[PDB]
Structure formats: structure tokens, C-alpha cells
Design a protein around this ligand. Structure first.
Ligand SMILES: [Mg+2]
Ligand SMILES: [Mg+2]
Ligand SMILES: [Mg+2]
Ligand SMILES: [Mg+2]
Ligand SMILES: [Mg+2]
Ligand SMILES: [Mg+2]
Ligand SMILES: [Mg+2]
Ligand SMILES: [Mg+2]
Ligand SMILES: [Mg+2]
Ligand SMILES: [Mg+2]
Ligand SMILES: [Mg+2]
Ligand SMILES: [Mg+2]
Ligand SMILES: [Mg+2]
Ligand SMILES: [Mg+2]
Ligand SMILES: [Mg+2]
Ligand SMILES: [Mg+2]
Ligand SMILES: [Mg+2]
Ligand SMILES: [Mg+2]
Ligand SMILES: [Mg+2]
Ligand SMILES: [Mg+2]
Ligand SMILES: [Mg+2]
Ligand SMILES: [Mg+2]
Ligand SMILES: [Mg+2]
Ligand SMILES: [Mg+2]
Ligand SMILES: [Mg+2]
Ligand SMILES: [Mg+2]
Ligand SMILES: [Mg+2]
Ligand SMILES: [Mg+2]
Ligand SMILES: [Mg+2]
Ligand SMILES: [Mg+2]
Ligand SMILES: [Mg+2]
Ligand SMILES: [Mg+2]
Ligand SMILES: [Mg+2]
Ligand SMILES: [Mg+2]
Ligand SMILES: [Mg+2]
Ligand SMILES: [Mg+2]
Ligand SMILES: [Mg+2]
Ligand SMILES: [Mg+2]
Ligand SMILES: [Mg+2]
Ligand SMILES: [Mg+2]
Ligand SMILES: [Mg+2]
Ligand SMILES: [Mg+2]
Ligand SMILES: [Mg+2]
Ligand SMILES: [Mg+2]
Ligand SMILES: [Mg+2]
Ligand SMILES: [Mg+2]
Ligand SMILES: [Mg+2]
Ligand SMILES: [Mg+2]
Ligand SMILES: [Mg+2]
Ligand SMILES: [Mg+2]
Ligand SMILES: [Mg+2]
Ligand SMILES: [Mg+2]
Ligand SMILES: [Mg+2]
Ligand SMILES: [Mg+2]
Ligand SMILES: [Mg+2]
Ligand SMILES: [Mg+2]
Ligand SMILES: [Mg+2]
Ligand SMILES: [Mg+2]
Ligand SMILES: [Zn+2]
Lengths: 105, 58, 205, 159
RNA sequence: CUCGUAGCGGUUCUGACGUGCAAAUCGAUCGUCGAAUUUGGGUAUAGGGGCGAAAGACUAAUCGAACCAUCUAGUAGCUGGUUCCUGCCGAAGUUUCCCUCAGGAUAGCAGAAGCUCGUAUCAGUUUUAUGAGGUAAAGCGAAUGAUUAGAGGUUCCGGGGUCACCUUGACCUAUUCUCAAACUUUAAAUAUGUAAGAAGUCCUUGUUACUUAAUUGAACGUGGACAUUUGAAUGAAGAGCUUUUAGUGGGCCAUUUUUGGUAAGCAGAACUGGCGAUGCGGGAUGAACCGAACGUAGAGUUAAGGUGCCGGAAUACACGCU
RNA sequence: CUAAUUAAAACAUAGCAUUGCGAUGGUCAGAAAGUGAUGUUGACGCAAUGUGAUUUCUGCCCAGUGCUCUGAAUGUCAAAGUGAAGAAAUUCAACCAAGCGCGGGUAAACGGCGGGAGUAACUAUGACUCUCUUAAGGUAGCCAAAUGCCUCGUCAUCUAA
RNA sequence: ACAUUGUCAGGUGGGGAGUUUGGCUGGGGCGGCACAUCUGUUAAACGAUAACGCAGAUGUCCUAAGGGGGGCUCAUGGAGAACAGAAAUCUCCAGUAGAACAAAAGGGUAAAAGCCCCCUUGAUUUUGAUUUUCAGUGUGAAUACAAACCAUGAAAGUGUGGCCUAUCGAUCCUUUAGUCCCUCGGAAUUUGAGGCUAGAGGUGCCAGAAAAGUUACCACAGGGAUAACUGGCUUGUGGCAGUCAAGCGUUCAUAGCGACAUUGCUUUUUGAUUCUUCGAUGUCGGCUCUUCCUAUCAUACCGAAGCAGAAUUCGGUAAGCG
RNA sequence: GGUUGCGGCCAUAUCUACCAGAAAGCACCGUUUCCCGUCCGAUCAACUGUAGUUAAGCUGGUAAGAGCCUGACCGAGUAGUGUAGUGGGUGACCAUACGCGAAACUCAGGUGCUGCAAUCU
């Protein structure tokens, strides 16, 4: 899946409130950040005996994750989050479809 | 065990023991589902009708 | 080795022919449907004698071939192979299944059958009027190869046509009758007059 | 497994009515729908947007909402032991007027008209419709028409 | 080491007995009989422990985990049972979700309590008008796809036979026989949607920020016109509404149309009627068939079925057949 | 030895072999102990196993997994300790023991022990040979055996069968 | 001043402990997914409708294969061009779609929905309404609006992803975007944490537990809701019959036979129901002993022969007796 | 009545062959500086109705035309189907009773109608 890395979408930036240009990056999660409350509760609950308390999930079934485009307005730096479908490949760069050219390999 | 999966035998006897009702229409339906532009004007087209009715009677 | 003809005798399931979902149909064993002097003209054989089913059933492809052999063998040994035109007017298109404890029961194709209505013609023999009792006994022996009950109806048509013997005659001194390979073409009051002249020119005299 | 999609079992129903494929003729787009008009739902397969679900093909209902290209139609749907009000957003090329309601509304104009000369004279003009009443007396003549038929025919096979 | 007593074991009769003499005996026949023998007393090892020349054997008739008491009335979607009478009403074995499929929840079916009112609004029905359907049938010299047989049309489309020929293949044109659950121009019956008016129709013209080039349209109105033949038929047993709650959520049969299966008192569907939950008359007998559904009695008449005798009722009448 | 349905081919056995241990020890107890068994002991001992008298032999395999090794030392390496930034809670980085990974030894440790094709002056048989994968490709022996489905294999013997 | 000891941290640790090992199922096991889906059929012309029914497809692909505009006609056939033929390009005629539209199938489409070109990001923001599955919950998909903001085109218009019908996911936790908004409860500042609105990360057993085996030592609650033995139904198969007669039988269908067909019989063979039996109907063979059937091996009496005799073979009555 | 522009229903209008068209409109037709587009003024754009023509388009007629459309007591009250019986039949199926009722075929007839505007010996 090919997505352009520059987009003209609506901005909820309270100054644009219109279609502006957006620079587009793919969204990655970010680190778990200990001292989150559910992580501190995880630390106090695993201590002692009896072992694992919360479930440890195993039967994963998806070959894919939905890709989230993490946009940013070029004018007011107000960011957006768009979501696409499941895809085994996600290409953010260029390499557009040249039509009348000979195949190879 | 092996079980009878599905049948609609006896389902219309129960459907008629309490007598199927048509949905009991009313004068003045709800304006949910109307074109919101039309409903928006209809608030004013009936407000001013009441002003021209209430002032003309008094 | 084969299930008897009483097993699939009655029509209990729908017509199940050979197409893009069956794909594995075992072929029939009646593959000849016209017999005798099939290239005789219409006028040589004026007398159509029929085998007609009085019961709604299935004739099998084995049975239609076996009755064809028996009826052909009698008529040639009495009057010869150019004294009749035996036409089997029945084609076995219906495919029968077979299952081979009750699980995965859906079947694999077994044999070919031919659904015949009450009043449907099985066989038709056209011949001369002198050879009539030969043809009946040739068809009377062919009854034994068939389940159900079959009738020997002397038709009133002229041969293998759809018009009666005197109706075919008044069309014959008149010019609406002319030969083809196996059958006879007829004249109409319709179409272009030039094509009514190209073919059929003995008319308009 | 089993398939229960939106256009399931709609093979012949959404088909396009032999030798009448192609574009929608323009009288469909010139028809005028008002709220309260009673319309017959028949989906045109060549228009895939605004297309009713297969339950509503042939159903008849009342226009309640009017948008740019679509009417809002109310259909009564039997669900279990009662009917529920179904509100459908269908474009006007799946929709025609019910010709019965044109036949009704002229009879309303007729019964208004027939009661007018009931007010000139002769009250109770008997304007209600009646069923096919039994026939009256006849006297059937025989002049040129003497009664003749023969008997039942015998059995012939006529093949 | 050997034969063989006492002893100590326990092979076979698969003996007796098998409510015994006996919760392991009795009898015969057997193994072994001077040692890794047999045995008394003392002593040690204790239950998830001991002990085991090892069989999960033995550890007080208890052993793949002793016995006693407590926690403990442990838990049970499983089986049994659940105690007086009469009256009235009266089911379900189906929906959706659930580590759900012997169970729940949820909707449906049922009862009760009523409440607001008083024949409105309706209806497992018809008629009239108006749609929708692609099934049965029909069709294949109509398309797609099968399939039968001859006709007419001459080509390095490799027909060998000249180096224009009896012994050409297909192809095209007109015919012909036979067909289709996943083919079709057509197209039923049955079933199905809507309408058949006062919340209506008509006239006048009031409002609006919607809409129009334009009070034009749209929607809702004021005022006025029409009264029960007020806009088909038949019925209506009161209509409408609310709350709460039980059981059920194993089904089965028959007619018709069905899928699978050679077939089934088979496995699965659809519509209806039944049984379950139901007696009564008939089918000798039978959950389901036929007739008909039930307070206690009397009289009459019937149903389905019968009327030689059992057995109430004509060894009736009639025409034949065997 | 299965008391009370199995007395046996099962268990034991001598013989054989393997393994661990020189006492601050091996093997095992115990909640701990200034606590125990072996042990009133000391490798001709004690402990842990396997096979099971004698005759005659115990082939090939260390790739797997276990066991073992004064073996390799920036692959991984927890806690403590060290350092940087921050106001600090904290974040990061370096260092990083055992153990794992790496290398090796061990089969009387657990265990394993092959196909297709053509070839001898017979027709196929196949000493030898060509590949596929091995760590090794079942040696010595023995056998329709208490181990072989086919199988009541084939032959001989026993019998009239 | 090292072992030892106390505490903590990494390893080792079935020696010991506890727990887990889904469901549907013509019994369970096995295989498969009918477990969440789509198209056509099943499915019987509204809708709905089962089977481990049938034929296929789903967990993708796409910045264009999305949006708009303009121009053009596609499969294929015929005739024509040097190499060049059966297939290279070129030109005309015929071409209702016989092509193509990402992917199955069905439907739809001819100045287009297809082919070529130009411009673009509407595959956008915000809140409701609606349709299907349906409890009228959720999820997914979709339809019509409305407020914006854009694309596009001359414009009317069209666009809230793919021409339509499938292509997907709760609480808790983590993360990101938004406001720079609420709180940290003695009062503040700064980090830090918590909060609100919208997405992501995932439960495919797809409304979503965190889980390897075996039991012949097994045990308990039940279950004929369930496998075997029997009885009963059904009868593929097994056997036994019959009709027809192409042929065999030196000639000659039928003395005796008999193909291709066809119609039945048996429940003693073998297959299908899980109907009855799980608070147990004692499971094979044999021995012993009785009776019954006749589809007759012998014996009695017969008929036929391709019956000279002798011996056979076909058939009848017949189960009295072996 | 013809014709043109815009249409409605979308073959009674389509397709095949041959023949006619007065006026008018429409068309073919002439040219390429401009606007514009192409490999190429054939398409498209632009220009003058100027050089000419009904040859084509187009309209209409002809055709025992093909097709399409309408009707039929044409098939045919047929096939099918709803409902009923302790009807028939071993069954397959069938007959009757009260209803509903085709299609193919076959004959007959037809071959655009019409709206708004504008013009035409
Ligand atoms: Mg059930
Ligand atoms: Mg479907
Ligand atoms: Mg001794
Ligand atoms: Mg001794
Ligand atoms: Mg002794
Ligand atoms: Mg013993
Ligand atoms: Mg005994
Ligand atoms: Mg006693
Ligand atoms: Mg001795
Ligand atoms: Mg003693
Ligand atoms: Mg223990
Ligand atoms: Mg054991
Ligand atoms: Mg105890
Ligand atoms: Mg208890
Ligand atoms: Mg009652
Ligand atoms: Mg679900
Ligand atoms: Mg349940
Ligand atoms: Mg129970
Ligand atoms: Mg109730
Ligand atoms: Mg159809
Ligand atoms: Mg049919
Ligand atoms: Mg069907
Ligand atoms: Mg129907
Ligand atoms: Mg339930
Ligand atoms: Mg139950
Ligand atoms: Mg079937
Ligand atoms: Mg009862
Ligand atoms: Mg009766
Ligand atoms: Mg009774
Ligand atoms: Mg009886
Ligand atoms: Mg009787
Ligand atoms: Mg009394
Ligand atoms: Mg009497
Ligand atoms: Mg014993
Ligand atoms: Mg000691
Ligand atoms: Mg060895
Ligand atoms: Mg550390
Ligand atoms: Mg060897
Ligand atoms: Mg269908
Ligand atoms: Mg349907
Ligand atoms: Mg396919
Ligand atoms: Mg998928
Ligand atoms: Mg264009
Ligand atoms: Mg596609
Ligand atoms: Mg397709
Ligand atoms: Mg979904
Ligand atoms: Mg939770
Ligand atoms: Mg505080
Ligand atoms: Mg925060
Ligand atoms: Mg689920
Ligand atoms: Mg019991
Ligand atoms: Mg006999
Ligand atoms: Mg005898
Ligand atoms: Mg005899
Ligand atoms: Mg007897
Ligand atoms: Mg006897
Ligand atoms: Mg020019
Ligand atoms: Mg009845
Ligand atoms: Zn911005």
C-alpha cells in the first residue's frame, strides 16, 4: 500500500479550520513508561508467591496491524490520526504507478 | 448429543395467540429522521403561526 | 456389482445432469438412436408404429440399449435391415448417484437414466403398410426389456411427421412437400416470395 | 458455512427486465414525491446507491422525508408478534407512485362530485361500492339460435 | 545336595463348601524340609510417611495412599423425592448471546394485578383497485449449455488419390429427435405488500430563517362547505394501555411440497393440523388415523363405524362377478 | 512375592561391569541445633546403579539429549557497587559471578543401526561399483522363535488325516 | 579475618506441590470447521428456513484499482501490407457486449461503471437519523441528510473510499492525538501522576479464560440423551427364484444351459436407526437335550432327458424317517 | 403536412435490400490567420454561406422481408395448481368434486406516437 507523505486534509487547528497541507508519518506506539498506574499496580501484585496473576495471552491470530497515519499541519502544528485497513505491506514513500513500462524479474 | 437444530413449527401459533398489532399511528409524528433543514425552518414556521394566532385572539 | 434397476426406479430427486458441478459422469451405453434405413425418404415409410409409456418412471441406459438390440434383431431377420427406420426417441440424460456409516453421504455418479412420462413415446418405427405386423412383434418383444407397462400405438401421422396421412396427401399433390436428407421441408404463406420461388418451385403453377 | 449477506438470494430480483437494460429513462427523475404519498418500492439494479434491502422489494409505503435525490419511506415490517416501523432512505429511481392511490383519489373527487347533484335533489345517492351482485332475470331467445350440442366424444389416441 | 516326617508354604482338582464350620475353611494331591530355615518375647522404623529378595505388595478383615475427630450441612449444570380439597385460566420444547450443547441469560408462549375509556379501533377472511415474485408448467428451427440423425455449399485450415478426381474432416445455411437444481424470451395456482377517507376532500389565505426568477412551492394552520350509504363485504366475542411473574428453551407424529440416502419405525427442512398436555365413539388391540374434544343428569337425533352369531342394529332389497 | 482369584518366564542371587568419594568427603537425614545415619567405618571401604552362574562373545555410532571438562573469554550477565544529566523522585551508560551459548570427551549413558538404478561368457542373483541423505548405516550371531501382519509362509519330518 | 552464619539477588531444581488440557460430531477417537464470513444453489416464485447438503471464494489488494472531467469503444470475425506465416504492426468493414471492471459467484454498466489522457485527495471534520444481522443490544458493513472544508468540471452536478453484495474485535491495561482543560483534598511553584474526548495495540474458539499428556489401578454423579451382544425396522451386499431369448448344446433357443436387460424372495451372511436395556437381559465356542421350518442329501412314489442298459442330470408330491 | 432545436414513452421507432424527396431547414461541402486540438484542419476548433451537390446523411415508400407490437372461443379450459374424500391402484401414479388457470405453437392485424418552440411554394 502506497500512501503519499504529504496530504491536503481538514485541520481542526482552531486557526486553520480548513484544508491545509499535512506532513505524514506512520504512528509507532511509544515505550511502556513505568510509573503508569497499571504498571505500578502490576508491580505490587506480582510480588510474593502464587506466581502469575493477570492472564498471559497466547492464541494470537492476526497476520497484520492496521497502520495509523500520524499527520501534522504545516501551518499550526496540529496533528491528526487517520486509520487505514489491515495490510501486509505499508509503503509511505513515493514510487508511484508508472503504467506503460516493461516488467522484470 | 445429536439435537434437532432448528424448526419454525409452532412459531406462528405463538405469534397469533396475542394478536399481532399494527404499530398504532398518530397524528403529528416525531420529527426525528426529517431533513434537518426542513425541521429547522418548521420551528419558525409554527412559532410565527402561534404569534399570529395568539395576538389575533387575546 | 451394480445396484438393480428397482433401486433408482422412481423419480424421487430432481433432474441432475452433467455440468460444471458433476464433472465425473460415467457415460451411457446406448449411443445409437437411429436404425434401419434412416436415409430412406419420407414417402418410403408411411406407417409410424410407436412404443408409448403408460407409467411415469425411469428407463435406464442399459434398458434402452437392450430393447434396441432386441427390436433391431427381430425386424432384420424377418424383413431385412432396409424395411424400417427405428428411431429411439428417448435419451438418457439423468445422472444417478451412489453412496459407497451414514456419514459423508453425498454420492458420486453411478448411471444414466431417462425420465419418461405417462403417454411419452419410447420408440418409433416407420415402415410400409405391409410390414405392420412384423413391426408390432418387433416392438412387442421390446416390451420385456423395460420395467413398467408400454403400449403399441398405431399412429395416424404419416411416418415421422406431424401431419396425418390424408393431410400429408393433400400437401403432396400440391407443392408444399419436398425432400431433405432425413425429413421433408414445408411451404408457408410467409417470408419473401423470392425464397418461396428459389426453394419449392413446383408450386405456383 | 452459511451466507447471509445484504444482496444474498437477490439473483433474479435485482435483474434488469429483458431488453430494458441501460440508462434510467427521465420520467423517473421528473416524478414529484410529496410527504404522505404512497409509493411502491422496486429496486433498480443499475443504481447501486440508495438501494433498498431485499425485504422491501414489492413493499408499499408512505413518504415521510424528502432529501436531494431520495425519499424517506415508512414500511411496516412484521418482527415476531408485532409490526415495527421501518424508515428507509431510498433514492427516487427505486421508487414509483402506487397507481391504486391515483385510483382512490379520483373516486374521492368523484364522490364529492356525485354528492353535489345529490344536494340539488334526491338525497342518499348510494355512492358506496357494491360487489358483483347475482344476475337478474333473462329471457333467452332462440331465433337463429336453436339449442344444439351433441354428446361426449369417444376415446381416440390421435397420435 | 537329595528321598521324606514334624514343621513351614500353598501347585492342581479350576474337588467339597459357596445364606459356609470358616468375611479364605475343609479334603486329596502337592513345594520345601539343617538353612537366604521356622518361630516366641523384647526393640526400632508411622501416613504422602514407613517398609518392600519389588506384587503398587504390606502397614489391625482398611492401601494406586491407613485409622480417628474437626473444618463440614464441603460442592453438585446430576439422580431420587417434595405432604389437603375445589374453582378459573393455561403453556413450551423456538429466537439471539454464552468454554454454550444434561445449563443459563434474553425474546416468545402463560397467569395475575389492574388502569384509561366505552364500540372506538380492528380482523390467521373475502371483494374492488394496485404492485411485487421467477416456482410448477412451458422453451431450445429464442441466448447460454447439452444432445440425435441425415441434406446443400469443393480448401499447401497436412484429406493421401491431378504434381481438376467414388474413396473431404471440420465449418456455414436450412431441417430433425431429445433435455437442464446452481439455463432462459414467457409464465401460473397457492402464498404476499398497500389502499378502500373526518388525522378526509374542497375553497379562501395566515406563518417561515426552508425553497422559488418571483408568497413561488413546501410544511403546518385560521375561517368557511359537506353527517353517518361518511365513501366495499362479513364479523367483532368490549377497545386501548401498563406492571409484574411462573414454567418452558430434550420433542414427536400425520397430510402435502422437500434435501441426503437403494431404503428405513433413518438423518434434516417448509406450511398446517395433532400428540406431548386428552379423555369420549370407531379403527379387535395402538400417543398421533376417522368422528368428536369433556360440569352433573334425563329425553331425542346423529357422526365415524356398522347391522349372520359373539354384538345394539335388515340371514334387507336390487344388478352382476367370483 | 501378589494374606483373600495371578508362584511365574517376575524379584533376588553369586559372578560381571559402570559411577562418586581421601573426611573441611561421597550418599542420605533433620524445622533447626554445640543435630544425625553409613561410622565401634577409611578404597580388599562406603555409597549409587546396570546386567545376572559357567562356555563363548559384546560389532558400528558422540549428530541428538543427558553427564562431564585446570577447557573460549565484550555473546548474554541479576542484585549490590561506579559514573553522566536532572532540583529530585527517576532515566541512561559502563563494569558485569554462577548458569546458558562455544569447543571437547563419554554408548556395560539414554538411545540409533538406510533407499533408487545398472552391472559376472546364467534370464532375473549381485562380490564390486554411481548418487540422495548418515553420526553410524544391524557386525558376530539367531529366527514364521514367548519377537513375522501377510501366514494355516515354503520344504522335510511326525500322522490314516 | 577465608570458609561458616544472617539477608537479598541470578541459575539449577517433575525431588516435592497445585492447576490446565474447548466445542460440533449419524456413539466417542481421528480427520475436517459446517466455530466469525460472502456468492449461487438446497429453498418448495414476499421474507425466513436445517444437514459433517452441494459448487466456489474470506482474514487480502489498491494513492489508484479512490474522486471529478473530457475523448474513445471492447471480445471477436472478415478482407487488405515487404520480411510476416496461425498468431509482430498498419487500414477498412461487421461487431448489444459475446470483452473489461483487483480477487469467488451472482447482479449492474456502451457518447459508461470499461480503454486513454488532465486535475486532485471527500480514503476529510462534527453531531444526529436510518438499513441489514437483530434482543430491534453490540460489532462490522452500508444508505440518506445536515453544518463545514476541499477536490472537480464550462456547468448542471458528483465525491464522507473501492459499481453492489465478504474482507473483521468488548471491559481492564498500554500508547497516541486533542484542550492546554479538571484534580492531586493545609497552601503554592515545578516535574510526575491521575482525569475527559477520538484512535491504536487483541482476543480467528472471531460478544473475547492465561494451560501438555496418559490411565488396563482408576474413582464419583449420572446417561440407553450414547458405542457391543440380543429383539424390531430398513435391505446397499450375500444367497435363492422368475420373465425374455441373442446364442451354447453334432442339426435344434428352452433335454440341460443362457448374454444384454428385467421382476421379486430371505433375515440364518455382511451393511444403515441409536428404538429398548447402564439401580448388570451373565458376553464366543463346545457338550447335553428337545422341538420347529423346507429352500430335500438320503429313503418312498413319480414326471423329463441329448433316459439303450448301468450310472447320472433336471423337476414334482413329501420334513414320515435318518 | 414538411423541416429544425429541445424532448416524453423507448423497435409499431430496430435491421436487410431497392426506389423517391417540391420548397424550406438540415447535411455534405470551401479555407486555415485567429481561439483550439491533433502523427495528420479526417475528428475537434475557428470562417465565409462564399466554389457546388442532394451522392451520402436524413425523411418516406416498397418487401406474401427478418425482427418487434396488438388481438384471438388459436392452442386450451390444456399443462400446472389450491381445496376434498375410510375415492381407484400392489405401487408408480390416476380419476372425480369445488375453484384458479398458462406458455410454446397457430391465424388475423400493424410498423412510431406525441409535447414545446421556430420556419417552409
Ligand atoms: Mg432444541
Ligand atoms: Mg448467499
Ligand atoms: Mg535342598
Ligand atoms: Mg528336595
Ligand atoms: Mg512336610
Ligand atoms: Mg494360588
Ligand atoms: Mg473350588
Ligand atoms: Mg451357621
Ligand atoms: Mg531334604
Ligand atoms: Mg509351632
Ligand atoms: Mg512421601
Ligand atoms: Mg503394575
Ligand atoms: Mg480412613
Ligand atoms: Mg454431604
Ligand atoms: Mg381452558
Ligand atoms: Mg455470536
Ligand atoms: Mg441448551
Ligand atoms: Mg436430566
Ligand atoms: Mg398473560
Ligand atoms: Mg426460473
Ligand atoms: Mg420444469
Ligand atoms: Mg428447488
Ligand atoms: Mg409461494
Ligand atoms: Mg437454553
Ligand atoms: Mg431439558
Ligand atoms: Mg434426496
Ligand atoms: Mg396424556
Ligand atoms: Mg372410524
Ligand atoms: Mg380410542
Ligand atoms: Mg386392525
Ligand atoms: Mg371389525
Ligand atoms: Mg335430571
Ligand atoms: Mg343382535
Ligand atoms: Mg493368592
Ligand atoms: Mg551411630
Ligand atoms: Mg554394545
Ligand atoms: Mg545488577
Ligand atoms: Mg545378518
Ligand atoms: Mg431459485
Ligand atoms: Mg424466499
Ligand atoms: Mg468458480
Ligand atoms: Mg476469511
Ligand atoms: Mg471525456
Ligand atoms: Mg474486479
Ligand atoms: Mg463472477
Ligand atoms: Mg460483519
Ligand atoms: Mg476485565
Ligand atoms: Mg495532601
Ligand atoms: Mg497527562
Ligand atoms: Mg461465539
Ligand atoms: Mg435402572
Ligand atoms: Mg417342497
Ligand atoms: Mg427325495
Ligand atoms: Mg427330489
Ligand atoms: Mg409336519
Ligand atoms: Mg417329526
Ligand atoms: Mg475541412
Ligand atoms: Mg379428513
Ligand atoms: Zn492547521
Amino acid at each position: 500500500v502506497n500512501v503519499p507523505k504529504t496530504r491536503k486534509t481538514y485541520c481542526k487547528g482552531k486557526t486553520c479550520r480548513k484544508h491545509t497541507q499535512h506532513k505524514v508519518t506512520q504512528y509507532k506506539a511509544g515505550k511502556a513508561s513505568l510509573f503508569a498506574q497499571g504498571k505500578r499496580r502490576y508491580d505490587r501484585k506480582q510480588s510474593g508467591f502464587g506466581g502469575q496473576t493477570k492472564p498471559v495471552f497466547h492464541k494470537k491470530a492476526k497476520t497484520t496491524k492496521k497502520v495509523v497515519l500520524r499527520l501534522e499541519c504545516v501551518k499550526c502544528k496540529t496533528r491528526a490520526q487517520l486509520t487505514l485497513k489491515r495490510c501486509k505491506h505499508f509503503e509511505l514513500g513515493g514510487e508511484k504507478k508508472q503504467k506503460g513500462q516493461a516488467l522484470q524479474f | 448429543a445429536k439435537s434437532k437444530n432448528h424448526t419454525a413449527h409452532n412459531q406462528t401459533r405463538k405469534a397469533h395467540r396475542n394478536g399481532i398489532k399494527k404499530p398504532k399511528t398518530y397524528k403529528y409524528p416525531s420529527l426525528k429522521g426529517v431533513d434537518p433543514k426542513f425541521r429547522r425552518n418548521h420551528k419558525h414556521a409554527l412559532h410565527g403561526t402561534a404569534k399570529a394566532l395568539a395576538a389575533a385572539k387575546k | 456389482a451394480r445396484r438393480p434397476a428397482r433401486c433408482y426406479r422412481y423419480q424421487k430427486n430432481k433432474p441432475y445432469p452433467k455440468s460444471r458441478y458433476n464433472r465425473a459422469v460415467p457415460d451411457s451405453k446406448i449411443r445409437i438412436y437411429d436404425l434401419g434405413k434412416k436415409k430412406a425418404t419420407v414417402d418410403e415409410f408411411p406407417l409410424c408404429v410407436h412404443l408409448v409409456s403408460n407409467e411415469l418412471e425411469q428407463l435406464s441406459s442399459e434398458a434402452l440399449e437392450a430393447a434396441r438390440i432386441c427390436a433391431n434383431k427381430y425386424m432384420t431377420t424377418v424383413s431385412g435391415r432396409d424395411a424400417f427406420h427405428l428411431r429411439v426417441r428417448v435419451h438418457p440424460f439423468h445422472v444417478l448417484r451412489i453412496n459407497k456409516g451414514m456419514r459423508g453421504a453425498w454420492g458420486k455418479p453411478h448411471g444414466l437414466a431417462a425420465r419418461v412420462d405417462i403417454g411419452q413415446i419410447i420408440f418409433s418405427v416407420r415402415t410400409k403398410d405391409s410390414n405392420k405386423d412384423v413391426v408390432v412383434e418387433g416392438l412387442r418383444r421390446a416390451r420385456y426389456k423395460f420395467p413398467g407397462q408400454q403400449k403399441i400405438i398405431l399412429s395416424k401421422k404419416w411416418g415421422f411427421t406431424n401431419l396425418d396421412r390424408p393431410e400429408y396427401l393433400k400437401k403432396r399433390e400440391a407443392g408444399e412437400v419436398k425432400d431433405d436428407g432425413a425429413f421433408v421441408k414445408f411451404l408457408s404463406k410467409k417470408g419473401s416470395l423470392e425464397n418461396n420461388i428459389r426453394e419449392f418451385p413446383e408450386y405456383f403453377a | 458455512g452459511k451466507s447471509h449477506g445484504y444482496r444474498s438470494r437477490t439473483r433474479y430480483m435485482f435483474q434488469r427486465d429483458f431488453r430494458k437494460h441501460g440508462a434510467v429513462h427521465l420520467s423517473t427523475y421528473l416524478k414529484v414525491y410529496k410527504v404522505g404519498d404512497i409509493v411502491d418500492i422496486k429496486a433498480n439494479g443499475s443504481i447501486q446507491k440508495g438501494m433498498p434491502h431485499k425485504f422491501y422489494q414489492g413493499k408499499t409505503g408512505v413518504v415521510y422525508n424528502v432529501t436531494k435525490s431520495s425519499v424517506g419511506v415508512i414500511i411496516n415490517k412484521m418482527v415476531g408478534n408485532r409490526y415495527l416501523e421501518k424508515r428507509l432512505n431510498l433514492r427516487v429511481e427505486h421508487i414509483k407512485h402506487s397507481k391504486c392511490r391515483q385510483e382512490f383519489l379520483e373516486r374521492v373527487k368523484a364522490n364529492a362530485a356525485k354528492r353535489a347533484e345529490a344536494k340539488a335533489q334526491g338525497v342518499a345517492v348510494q355512492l358506496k361500492r357494491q360487489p358483483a351482485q347475482p344476475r337478474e332475470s333473462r329471457i333467452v331467445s332462440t331465433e337463429g339460435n336453436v339449442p344444439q350440442t351433441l354428446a361426449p366424444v369417444p376415446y381416440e389416441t390421435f397420435i
